[PDB]
Amino acid sequence: RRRHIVRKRTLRRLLQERELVEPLTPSGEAPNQALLRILKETEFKKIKVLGSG
Structure with a gap:
């Protein structure tokens, strides 16, 4: 775990796609x-977000 994004169940669609x-x-x-x-x-x-600084 690290961020907040559906990856576990997502790859299922990728591997199946x-x-x-x-x-x-x-x-x-x-x-x-x-x-x-x-x-x-x-x-x-x-x-705008990447060039915040």
Whole structure:
């Protein structure tokens, strides 16, 4: 234990998603949206927090 995030039961979906979303599909439709939702929903969120000091 260290942080607060579902990892034990999560990996279960990952290990089971090896025959669906993983081989060709990284997360879903494509990575372009992964970086998009990350960079577009965390564009300023992560930076403002990371550049606190």
